[PDB]
Ligand binder design. Structure first.
Ligand SMILES: CCCCCCCCCCCCCCCCCC(=O)OC[C@H](COP(=O)([O-])OCC(O)COP(=O)([O-])OC[C@@H](COC(=O)CCCCCCCCCCCCCCCCC)OC(=O)CCCCCCCCCCCCCCCCC)OC(=O)CCCCCCCCCCCCCCCCC
Ligand SMILES: CCCCCCCCCCCCCCCCCC(=O)OC[C@H](COP(=O)([O-])OCC(O)COP(=O)([O-])OC[C@@H](COC(=O)CCCCCCCCCCCCCCCCC)OC(=O)CCCCCCCCCCCCCCCCC)OC(=O)CCCCCCCCCCCCCCCCC
Ligand SMILES: CCCCCCCCCCCCCCCCCC(=O)OC[C@H](COP(=O)([O-])OCC(O)COP(=O)([O-])OC[C@@H](COC(=O)CCCCCCCCCCCCCCCCC)OC(=O)CCCCCCCCCCCCCCCCC)OC(=O)CCCCCCCCCCCCCCCCC
Ligand SMILES: CCCCCCCCCCCCCCCCC[C@@H](O)O[C@H](CO[C@H](O)CCCCCCCCCCCCCCC)COP(=O)(O)OCC[N+](C)(C)C
Ligand SMILES: CCCCCCCCCCCCCCCCC[C@@H](O)O[C@H](CO[C@H](O)CCCCCCCCCCCCCCC)COP(=O)(O)OCC[N+](C)(C)C
Ligand SMILES: CCCCCCCCCCCCCCCCC[C@@H](O)O[C@H](CO[C@H](O)CCCCCCCCCCCCCCC)COP(=O)(O)OCC[N+](C)(C)C
Ligand SMILES: CCCCCCCC/C=C\CCCCCCCC(=O)OC[C@H](COP(=O)(O)OCCN)OC(=O)CCCCCCC/C=C\CCCCCCCC
Ligand SMILES: CCCCCCCC/C=C\CCCCCCCC(=O)OC[C@H](COP(=O)(O)OCCN)OC(=O)CCCCCCC/C=C\CCCCCCCC
Ligand SMILES: CCCCCCCC/C=C\CCCCCCCC(=O)O[C@H](COC(=O)CCCCCCC/C=C/CCCCCCCC)COP(=O)(O)OCCN
Lengths: 104, 54, 64, 53, 56, 175, 459, 329, 121
């Protein structure tokens, strides 16, 4: 049911196709930001914040309460890296550097 | 997963083979159909056989 | 669908050979192989030298 | 088929090897022979090549 | 009812016929490799009073 | 039990102490083993005797297969395939028998270690030394042959071992 | 050997003369009967072989593979019964014909007294699999997958034909018995090096060796369930069987020739196990797990020790059974969801408890839990590699840990958690699927009682 | 004849009958937990007799009843070691399991899958008995992995909770890190001593080298949650309280210390491995007590107490006092 | 090899007169049965192409195809066997007539042959 134009494409170089890509991924143009146009094949895919899924709001009524995701929302490239069963980025009461120094 | 498997291993054997074969096919099959060039090549070929194989 | 397609099938058409990609691919795909080859070759050369010299004490070593 | 495989006759000859080993060890211990021998074949029947170096 | 279920169930006999034919062909091919029967140095045996071949 | 040879599997006489009760208290072990005997060993013995008489009602025999000796690989021609086949089969049978001999020696060693208890390091020197000889011999005969082993490779290994021994003996005598 | 071959051939006229609604029943019954006949072959001797005739022989290396091949066909028919419901009778008969022809080619391949016959059948297996993949395939990438699968194999195996004809011209025979008895050492020469490469690469590419494994994920993901079952269970073991048969003439050249391939396999098991951790597709994950297992089998064959060979045989059989079961479970999920994505259908243990039990048992067997034969082969190969070099233990342990990690990851992602709310078409599991899983899993736990049946000729 | 062996095998055999009846009608009724508890109590009172015989005399036996397979010169058979350690640990474990199961009949009363929970407890107990009485390395590995799998299944008992699954996978990860060293030790012993049997290993190892003992120490540290691989044990409190009382408190987590005890004849002939064991135990007990001193969850506090006690046990192993460590267990 | 120029060979004979001294192939030869199978397949394909009931459209036509294939296969087998017999005959005659090129190799036993042993480690 998904059409050809609804699939990810190449890196956007013009503002018009930047806006088209932002519209395709269901987000604002000002909030849209692709990965840097390096050799790796990210192409046209939003570079979402690297925040984990554990630190999303546990009180919002998500369509997927376990994964804390909403239907139709753009999915982070590394979603399976942050699934509340794996590495999380929740802020800690003590800073990372101080913790490392104390532990070491 | 990506850098090696989906990119470089794919580039080495299969993509390189496909690219080379397609380029050679384009070069070989891109002939305008003029007997001028064909028999000029035949003349060039005939001369080479006489002087290079004996 | 977009997530899975971008993760799996949209990689190569957007790939471009760059100094970064070339260097990282060469390192991550060649360096470990030669490192492990050197390690195992040195270990086996040492073991063979000890066996030829006869000072390894392989008593009770029946199954291999 | 599982029952058939369970009751397959010994064509691999395991208990036969057990009996052969038992009788050989009985013979060798009794006669003072030192069990197993280092050479698999008797050296009398091998003609080594003289080096003369 | 015989002569009616046969027209629908005749196919079942084919795999089994193949098995017995294969056994027969295996024995027939075995019959051509008797050049050393009772001639091996390990199982060289004198025949029984009512024995023609050690194995078939 | 007559089911196995006592010479192949030697055992000490198994001397055991006698009960010397120092007190008047009745120990529970004897009462428990008596009730165990009455409730277990008797029905089991009766069932075994019934099964044994049923077996004695129908008795039949099976025999150990004897194999003749055949020429070995050292007296086979270069491309003679029949004698090579016979020698290879004989060598494989000998290899199996050697493996089972090593198995017997290992079983002896394990039984000695378990039986001797806390003094195994001294009371099992004989089994350890026998196992040392058998392991050394077995190792010399079959080590490093590889997955595709054969009588020819074993003969080549023995040949090079004897060449090395002859060279060492000549160098030592002529020292 | 013809007592197995002839009934398999008669399967074709029986299928083509069957009623429109009785093809599956007859095919399953007669395939199961053929499998029972195959059980007799397992009895094996400690001596040379079961030399039936000049054309075919059987061995304790070929017997378990033949039994597995004969056993797989009824399971493939059971799996294929579902998605071919809306297919015309002629095309269903053609599908069954393809499966029967593939079984016949595999059966004749595993006996194969002579090496050119082995090559001919080893290549004849390529056509029915290609037709199955590119005809009864769901996606549009099946054509590219079939092209990859065909051309990798053919590029690998074309030099093998030249090597074999050269070997027969020089030695004079390609019968395996004469080859074994008249074996001669290979001198360290460039011509001998290239002959070794031509003899080895054809079987390496079908293992698949790491770096030459690209075709396998495509072919496995795009194939129908029966094709995936056969590819993961039997077609991968052809390379291992060929290497075991052909390494007899490659000595002593193999001692140093093996290093490039040993390093590739030892690092590639880690690479593919780590790849399995980040995968969004069940079939791709199972395929990469297969790649890791076959790389470890490659290591075992290259080490070339008796324990290596026994472990390799046991691991080949165990991996075939386990991968077939895992693919069947994935197909059962797919036929309900039609997505083939791990994260879509979640918490299926609440809805399908018995299928969750099947998932758990399959994951435990893939995890190599003792005393399963998977761990028997794994441990034998690990011990042989340790005797080869004590430093291999690090890589083997890393592979074991990552293997357990992604196996339990695959189990937890699909079976545990909260069910997806909007998915409401998850019907109760049918008796057919449950029987398929049971017939996959029970032979493994029965074989662990008699491990000597799958330990090969060097037992 | 010599009822010692018959009784010791009978206890382990009768521990498995409810597992066979788990497909019968009693499994679908509410009498199954009482059935399993009665079976465990009968097994305990039955196993009390061989301990009594050992106390009277000191009976020691090895039972190699079934021969599984033989690879060349190596013979693998189902062998049970019924020494002091086995005949002393079995009654204690059975007593604790009986008490915990009677407790669970009350604690888990409202849980819909209680028959399953009880069945799992029985399965874990069977695996632990396999681990304790094993005579060769392969059987002890079988028990080693069985207890780990039962721990994984019982920790993630509430499979709808993400944290339970995370804790179960964490336990699996750390136990596999230990399994690496276990496999290294098995490979070394098979390559050099030509056996996985304990008797042959004890004969052929008068001065045991560093590698097999280091592998054994790594496996023991992995399964007993020493300082390097400690965090999985406190996270294992996600499971039900009876699970934390039986497995992760007193029966499963002493498996590494028991493994080091079983190989004590080789441990005393090496001085560097003893030093490493001592240092590991000391750092583990200190760090775990320091963690415990300030926790607010009671289960976490008691789990850190268990970890500190295991550290003290491994200190005792390090000072070459294995029987004292067994008594402390 | 090339037997085209072989002496005393007739220019267009399928089977020479000297070929009749060889045992003829049996009527139950597996190659003859395979030729009959080829004819049966040809008949089935002919039925399928003409859009007729494949199994039971023309029995006479299928019989004719099978018979023709069997006949030609029998004659082809005769000629093939004769050609291989000629090859072997010429081989043996040439070996007989040139003793110096095919000397008898001095038979040697393995107990007195030194072969290098390569350990597998
Ligand atoms: C099998 C199991 C596992 C295996 C793992 C698989 C791994 C195998 C694949 C490995 C692939 C790595 C090498 C790829 C080829 C590199 C060239 C290329 O790809 O072309 C694209 C590209 C050509 O495009 P272009 O239009 O000419 O320029 C685009 C660049 O953005 C414009 O760049 P620039 O103009 O800035 O470049 C200047 C400078 C780059 O300056 C640098 O900073 C890099 C110098 C270091 O280049 C140099 O000076 C060359 C030195 O080449 C590059 O851009 C980079 C070239 C430099 C990369 C160095 C190569 C890496 C070293 C690998 C060699 C090790 C083994 C080799 C074996 C050979 C004997 C058998
Ligand atoms: C330990 C001795 C046991 C003796 C009793 C005999 C048991 C016969 C079992 C036969 C094989 C099982 C078939 C697999 C599919 C299960 C069918 C099913 O759906 O059950 C529904 C049925 C009805 O329940 P439901 O409420 O209608 O279904 C609701 C859901 O299904 C929910 O159901 P659920 O929540 O209850 O879960 C289903 C259950 C059943 O599913 C399973 O996972 C069972 C299969 C576990 C094995 C996984 C592969 C690992 C490698 C093991 C290979 C060794 C096999 C030995 C030979 C086997 C012969 C076939 O899964 C489990 O309970 C967890 C299993 C984890 C156990 C880990 C320990 C394994 C290693 C232990 C060493 C074994 C040898 C000892 C050697 C040393 C001592 C001599 O439930 C059962 O009857 C459960 C089966 C009994 C539990 C088996 C656990 C150990 C037995 C393993 C094989 C026998 C060992 C021989 C030694 C004897 C001494
Ligand atoms: C290893 C050696 C051993 C095995 C040898 C293997 C080959 C054997 C057979 C060789 C060829 C001869 C027969 C083929 C004729 C073609 C006619 C046909 O299509 O079948 C329709 C016909 C049934 O349909 P129908 O109701 O008559 O009318 C439908 C129309 O015909 C038309 O219906 P439609 O137009 O409505 O349907 C259209 C359909 C129909 O289109 C077709 O099916 C065309 C047929 C395939 C092409 C044949 C190529 C020539 C031979 C090549 C063999 C290659 C083998 C090498 C291995 C690689 C495999 C590719 O086409 C499609 O659907 C398009 C998609 C195609 C799918 C993918 C294509 C793959 C084809 C590769 C087939 C290769 C194996 C063939 C096996 C037999 C197949 C019939 O089938 C038959 O009944 C005849 C089959 C044989 C009869 C056996 C009866 C004897 C049993 C009783 C005596 C017992 C014997 C033992 C004696 C002792 C017992 C007491
Ligand atoms: C569900 C709830 C529980 C109910 C069930 C309760 C009962 C429990 C019993 C289940 C397992 C308990 C273990 C008991 C084991 C006893 C049986 C064992 O002793 O027999 C084994 C025998 O088992 C068979 O050997 C193995 C089974 C055969 C496996 C072949 C698979 C069948 C074909 C299917 C297709 C193949 C696919 C895979 C291709 C290779 C080993 O016997 P062995 O000591 O050795 O010698 C046999 C006796 N001799 C001396 C006379 C010869
Ligand atoms: C891509 C994904 C993986 C695919 C599979 C890869 C596996 C194939 C690798 C082939 C294995 C090695 C080939 C040859 C090994 C022999 C050892 C030799 O290379 O080492 C030195 C050889 O020295 C130099 O290497 C000479 C060769 C140099 C030219 C080779 C090109 C080097 C890189 C090519 C790699 C390309 C591979 C992919 C091809 C498409 C030893 O010095 P020397 O004592 O004198 O020679 C001993 C041999 N003798 C006795 C017969 C003479
Ligand atoms: C596709 C497979 C090939 C099919 C071939 C067509 C089948 C129909 C042809 C019908 C029979 C034609 C034979 C003609 C009758 C008499 C022939 C005879 O008079 O001529 C002889 C010649 O006999 C023919 O050559 C034999 C033809 C037999 C062809 C079959 C061989 C096919 C290869 C193996 C594939 C199996 C095919 C089996 C199914 C048909 C004498 O030749 P000669 O004057 O001295 O020298 C000329 C030839 N030289 C120069 C090469 C030496
Ligand atoms: C060697 C080990 C190499 C590291 C392996 C990396 C594996 C990565 C894949 C794991 C999947 C992701 C994952 O498991 O998530 C992390 C998961 C969840 O985090 P929680 O703390 O449980 O929080 C949940 C509550 N919110 O936590 C884990 O289980 C990760 C565990 C990683 C352990 C790595 C450290 C091991 C280092 C060992 C050093 C000590 C050596 C032993 C000393 C012995 C001396 C004799
Ligand atoms: C049950 C009710 C019926 C009661 C009547 C029977 C009473 C007992 C009489 C049994 C007859 C004796 C008998 O069983 O024969 C021996 C026979 C062994 O066969 P053998 O050929 O003699 O030697 C093995 C190698 N060939 O013993 C048995 O099979 C019975 C008991 C076997 C041991 C129990 C096995 C349980 C565990 C299953 C295997 C687990 C996987 C393997 C673990 C590997 C560990 C290293
Ligand atoms: C997945 C793709 C893999 C494709 C296969 C890659 C390896 C291919 C193997 C090399 C190709 C040639 C095989 C040789 C055939 C066997 C014959 C033989 O061994 O005899 C040698 C013949 O040896 C050769 O001629 C080899 C020449 C090589 C020419 C073809 C080159 C093809 C590519 C070679 C490099 C790549 C090989 C490894 C590829 C790695 C994987 C991609 C000796 O010939 P003689 O002259 O009779 O004896 C000498 C005394 N007078």
């Amino acid at each position: 049911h998904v059409t050809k134009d609804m699939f990810p494409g190449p890196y956007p170089k013009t503002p018009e196709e930047r806006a088209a890509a932002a519209k395709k991924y269901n987000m604002r143009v000002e909030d849209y930001e692709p990965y840097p146009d390096d050799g790796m094949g990210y192409g046209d895919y939003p570079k979402l914040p690297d925040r984990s899924q554990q630190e999303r709001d546990p009180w919002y009524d998500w369509d997927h309460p376990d994964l804390r995701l909403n239907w139709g929302e753009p999915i982070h490239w590394d979603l399976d890296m942050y699934i509340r069963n794996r590495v999380d980025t929740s802020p800690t009461p003590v800073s990372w550097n101080t913790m490392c120094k104390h532990l070491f | 997963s990506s850098l090696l498997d989906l990119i470089w291993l794919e580039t080495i054997l299969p993509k390189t083979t496909s690219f080379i074969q397609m380029k050679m096919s384009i070069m070989v099959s891109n002939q305008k159909g003029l007997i001028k060039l064909y028999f000029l090549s035949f003349l060039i070929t005939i001369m080479i056989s006489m002087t290079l194989f004996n | 669908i977009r997530w899975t397609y971008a993760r799996s099938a949209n990689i190569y058409p957007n790939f471009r050979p760059t100094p970064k990609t070339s260097l990282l691919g060469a390192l991550f795909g060649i360096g470990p192989l030669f490192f492990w080859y050197y390690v195992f070759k040195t270990d086996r050369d040492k073991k063979e030298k000890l066996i030829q010299e006869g000072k390894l004490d392989q008593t009770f070593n029946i199954s291999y | 088929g599982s029952t058939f495989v369970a009751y397959l006759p010994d064509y691999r000859m395991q208990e036969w090897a057990r009996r052969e080993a038992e009788r050989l060890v009985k013979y060798r211990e009794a006669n003072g022979l030192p069990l197993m021998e280092s050479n698999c074949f008797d050296p009398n029947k091998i003609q080594l090549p003289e080096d003369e170096d | 009812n015989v002569l009616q279920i046969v027209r629908d169930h005749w196919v079942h006999i084919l795999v089994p016929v193949g098995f017995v034919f294969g056994c027969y062909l295996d024995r027939r091919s075995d019959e051509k490799l008797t050049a050393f029967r009772n001639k091996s140095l390990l199982f060289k045996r004198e025949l029984r009073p009512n024995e023609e071949v050690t194995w078939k | 039990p007559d089911s196995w040879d006592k010479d192949v599997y030697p055992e000490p006489p198994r001397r055991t102490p006698a009960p010397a009760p120092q007190t008047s208290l009745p120990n529970p072990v004897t009462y428990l083993t008596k009730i165990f005997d009455l409730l277990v060993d008797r029905p089991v013995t009766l069932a075994r005797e019934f099964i044994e008489q049923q077996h004695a009602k129908n008795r039949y025999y099976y025999y150990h297969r004897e194999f003749r000796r055949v020429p070995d690989i050292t007296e086979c021609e270069e491309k003679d395939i029949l004698c090579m086949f016979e020698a290879e089969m004989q060598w494989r049978r000998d290899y199996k028998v050697d493996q089972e001999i090593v198995n017997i020696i290992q079983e002896r060693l394990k039984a000695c270690q378990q039986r001797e208890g806390e003094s195994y390091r001294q009371n099992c020197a004989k089994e350890l030394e026998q196992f040392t000889q058998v392991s050394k011999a077995f190792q010399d005969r079959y080590s490093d042959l590889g997955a595709h082993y054969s009588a020819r490779k074993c003969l080549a290994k023995q040949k090079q071992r004897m060449l090395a021994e002859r060279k060492a003996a000549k160098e030592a005598a002529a020292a | 050997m013809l007592k197995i071959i002839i009934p398999t051939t008669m399967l074709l006229p029986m299928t083509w003369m069957s009623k429109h609604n009785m093809i599956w029943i007859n095919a399953t019954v007669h395939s199961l009967l053929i499998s029972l006949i195959s059980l007799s072959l397992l009895n094996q001797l400690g001596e040379n072989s079961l030399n039936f005739s000049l054309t075919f022989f059987s061995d304790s290396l070929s017997a378990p593979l033949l039994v597995l091949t004969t056993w797989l066909l009824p399971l493939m028919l059971m799996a294929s019964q579902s998605h071919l419901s809306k297919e015309t009778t002629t095309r269903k008969k053609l599908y069954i014909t393809m499966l029967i022809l593939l079984q016949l080619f595999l059966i004749m391949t595993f006996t194969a007294t002579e090496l050119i016959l082995f090559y001919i059948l080893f290549e004849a297996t390529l056509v029915p699999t290609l037709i199955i993949i590119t005809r009864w395939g769901n996606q549009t990438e099946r054509l590219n997958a079939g092209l990859y699968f065909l051309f990798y194999t053919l590029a690998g195996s074309l030099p093998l034909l030249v090597a074999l004809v050269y070997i027969q011209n020089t030695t004079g025979s390609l019968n395996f018995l004469i080859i074994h008895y008249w074996s001669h050492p290979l001198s360290n020469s460039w011509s001998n090096i290239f002959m070794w490469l031509a003899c080895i690469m054809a079987f390496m590419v079908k293992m698949p060796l790491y770096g030459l494994h690209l075709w396998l994920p495509k072919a496995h993901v795009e194939a129908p369930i029966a094709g995936s079952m056969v590819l993961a269970a039997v077609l991968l073991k052809l390379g291992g069987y060929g290497m075991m048969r052909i390494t007899t003439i490659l000595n002593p050249l193999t001692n140093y020739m093996a290093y490039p391939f040993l390093m590739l396999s030892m690092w590639g098991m880690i690479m593919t196990s780590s790849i399995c951790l980040r995968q969004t597709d069940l079939k791709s994950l199972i395929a990469y797990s297969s790649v890791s297992h076959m790389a470890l089998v490659i290591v075992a064959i290259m080490i070339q020790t008796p324990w290596s060979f026994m472990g390799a045989t046991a691991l080949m059989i165990a991996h075939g059974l386990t991968s077939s079961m895992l693919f069947c479970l994935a197909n059962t999920n797919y036929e309900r969801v039609h997505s083939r994505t791990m994260i879509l259908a979640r918490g299926l243990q609440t809805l399908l408890p018995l299928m969750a039990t099947w998932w758990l048992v399959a994951s435990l067997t893939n995890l190599a839990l003792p005393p399963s034969i998977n761990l028997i082969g794994e441990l034998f190969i690990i011990t042989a590699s340790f005797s080869w070099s004590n430093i291999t233990i690090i890589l083997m342990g890393m592979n074991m840990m990552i293997t357990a990690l992604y196996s339990l990851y695959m189990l937890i992602t699909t079976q545990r958690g909260k069910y997806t709310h909007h998915i409401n078409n998850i019907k109760p599991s049918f008796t057919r699927e449950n029987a398929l899983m049971a017939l996959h899993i029970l032979p493994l736990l029965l074989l662990t009682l008699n491990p000597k049946m799958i330990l090969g000729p060097l037992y | 004849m010599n009822p010692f062996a018959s009784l010791t095998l009978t206890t382990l055999t009768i521990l498995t009958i409810p597992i066979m009846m788990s497909n019968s009608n009693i499994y679908k009724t509410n009498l199954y937990p009482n059935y399993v508890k009665t079976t465990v109590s009968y097994a305990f009172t039955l196993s009390l007799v061989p301990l009594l015989m050992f106390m009277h005399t000191g009976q020691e036996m090895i039972i190699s009843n079934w021969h599984w397979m033989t690879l060349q010169t190596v013979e693998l058979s189902l062998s049970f070691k019924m020494d002091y350690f086995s005949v002393m640990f079995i009654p204690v474990a059975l007593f604790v399991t009986w008490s915990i199961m009677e407790f669970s009949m009350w604690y888990m009363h409202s849980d819909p899958f209680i028959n399953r929970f009880f069945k799992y407890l029985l399965l874990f107990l069977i695996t632990m008995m396999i681990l304790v009485t094993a005579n060769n390395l392969f059987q002890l590995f079988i028990g080693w992995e069985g207890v780990g799998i039962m721990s994984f299944l019982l920790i993630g008992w509430w499979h709808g909770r993400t944290d339970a699954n995370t804790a179960a996978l964490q336990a699996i990860l750390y136990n596999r890190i230990g399994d690496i060293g276990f496999v290294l030790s098995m490979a070394w012993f098979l390559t050099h001593s030509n056996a996985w049997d304990l008797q042959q290993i004890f004969m052929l190892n008068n001065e045991c080298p560093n590698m097999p003992l280091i592998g054994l120490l790594l496996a023991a540290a992995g399964k007993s949650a020493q300082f390097g691989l400690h965090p999985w044990l406190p996270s294992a409190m996600e499971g039900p309280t009876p699970v934390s009382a039986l497995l992760h408190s007193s029966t499963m987590v002493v498996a590494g210390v028991f493994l080091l005890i079983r190989f004590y004849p080789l441990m005393e002939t090496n001085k560097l491995v003893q030093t490493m064991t001592l240092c590991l135990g000391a750092i583990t007990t200190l760090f775990t007590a320091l963690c415990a001193i300030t926790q607010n969850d009671i289960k976490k506090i008691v789990a850190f107490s268990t970890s500190s006690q295991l550290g003290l046990m491994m200190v005792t192993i390090g000072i070459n006092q294995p029987h004292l460590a067994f008594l402390h267990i | 090899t090339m037997m085209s120029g072989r002496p005393g060979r007739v220019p267009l004979q399928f089977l020479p007169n000297e070929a009749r001294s060889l045992p003829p192939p049996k009527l139950t030869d597996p190659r003859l049965v395979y030729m009959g199978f080829l004819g049966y397949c040809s008949g089935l394909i002919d039925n399928a192409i003409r859009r007729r009931p494949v199994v039971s459209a023309g029995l006479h036509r299928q019989l004719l195809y099978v018979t023709s294939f069997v006949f030609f296969g029998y004659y082809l087998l005769k000629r093939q066997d004769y050609m291989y017999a000629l090859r072997d005959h010429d081989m043996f005659a040439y070996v007989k007539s040139h003793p110096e090129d095919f000397p008898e190799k001095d038979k040697k036993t393995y107990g007195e042959i030194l072969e290098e042993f390569h350990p597998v480690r």
